Amino acid sequence: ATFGAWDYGVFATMLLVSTGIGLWVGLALAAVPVGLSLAASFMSAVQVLGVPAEAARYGLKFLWMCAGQLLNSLLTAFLFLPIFYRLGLTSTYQYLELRFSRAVRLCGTLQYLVATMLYTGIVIYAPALILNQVTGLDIWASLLSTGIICTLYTTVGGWTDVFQVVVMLVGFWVILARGVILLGGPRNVLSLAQQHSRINLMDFDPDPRSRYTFWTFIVGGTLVWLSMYGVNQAQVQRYVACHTEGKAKLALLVNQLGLFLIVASAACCGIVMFVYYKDCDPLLTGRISAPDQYMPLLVLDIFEDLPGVPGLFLACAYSGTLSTASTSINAMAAVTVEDLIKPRMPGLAPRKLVFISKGLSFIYGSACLTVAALSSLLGGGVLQGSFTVMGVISGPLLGAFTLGMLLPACNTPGVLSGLAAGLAVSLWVAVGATLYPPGEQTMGVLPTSAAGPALADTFYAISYLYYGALGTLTTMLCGALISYLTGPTKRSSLGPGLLWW
Ligand code: NA
Secondary structure, eight states: OOOOSHHHHHHHHHHHHHHHHHHHHHHOOOHHHHHHHHHHTTOSHHHHHHHHHHHHHHOSOTTHHHHHHHHHHHHIIIIITTGGGTTSOSOSTHHHHHHTOHHHHHHHHHHHHHHHHHHHHHHHHHHHHHHHHHHOOOHHHHHHHHHHHHHIIIIITOOHHHHHHHHHHHHHHHHHHHHHHHHOOHHHHHHHHHHTTOOOOOOOOOOTTSSSOHHHIIIIIHHHHHHHHTSOHHHHHHHHTTSOHHHHHHHHHHHHHHHHHHHHHHHHHHHHHHHHTSSBOHHHHTSOSSGGGHHHHHHHHHTSSSTTHHHHHHHHHHHHHHHHHHHHHHHHHHHHIIIIIHHHSTTSOHHHHHHHHHHHHHHHHHHHHHHHHHHHHSOOOHHHHHHHHHHHTHHHHHHHHHHHHHOSSOOHHHHHHHHHHHHHHHHHHHHHHHHSOOOHHHHTOOOOOBOOOHHHHHTTTSOTHHHHHHHHHHHHHHHHHHHHHHOOOOGGGSOSOSTTO
């Protein structure tokens, strides 16, 4: 029910060792490692908690997420990697500089900082949620602990990604292997899932309100993962540092393979989790309050006769998530210093520049902890929360980049107005859904079992995967229209720039 004795020791020892190695790194590349770094940059305990739960509650439709990811990678390697290897170097928003203006560069950097801050807040909340659900500590003590450890990793801590990805994969495989053997027979699990309508691959429901479906997954995942891989500063930084566009596409391929493995393993583990709870769903029984508590519960249930392992898995999912959060915070600080402060403070006390970078890292860590606390209080849903954070905020940024590249007739006022309109629409739909969320029947939640305004109904029910796609598209539409209203930009006035070349 709540770890025990051996698994408490396992959790504590593993977390202490992880902190020690982090401090050692902070005090004391090839396509494959950098691609696995690309994969690890966005996979954390959020995906451990959410993907199995979403698969269990909807059923093997979540595999279509992989397809979305696939599209993302392809588009990147064919739309943004070539241009961010010849035109936009060093930074990603320098393209917005040399294309539209420095004002658009500042707008893009601010959007990236806000999106990353909120995403890292959700990321920090995920291990806090794991600790609260497992160890029993109230969510606020768990948030205090996770924030303290993340700030220790960032301020003090200053192949780790490969280790994280392999740990995620092995954990998922161990869970879904122990579950199948305990239940008895992979064929039996598949048959039980089929009976309870968990094998639902071919879902083409054109209704956007249906939370998960091929039509929703392809477009929404493509757009969100593009905003997270095609224009994200960290990912593009990892591209341009790969030393070759052709060898950067190899990194993207490795990243895509890692994402495929993680998502497939998580969905299969979620199906095993449901078939484990085929007759008595914990949600109906009240054993847990939110679906995000599904994964920590099963881990406790499966290995009740095998102490220690739950602590190992849920301490790996803690340390890896904290490493991801610290990398995000430090990247935010570095981006702020390099892209904003340095231009207006060119040669003032490089030691002061290091001091300012440290201060920004601390400020961003604190802000991310505050966002984690807000997410804890402000309802729940971590996988949807992260995709609505990276969707509404960064979606318009991807729209700005795509308008700057694809459309020759795009101008600084055009892209700025498009960004404003896209942010407005995306936040409008997000708040409408938060206040007036759709029901389980509308979204498409599969049946459970316990035997052991017109606008708010037609729009706010839109699948969360459509938030980002709603923003980006808006930025591409409005930004285009205003461009042709104020003044169409001339192809001659642009350098290589546009993908058309
Ligand atoms: Na996510």
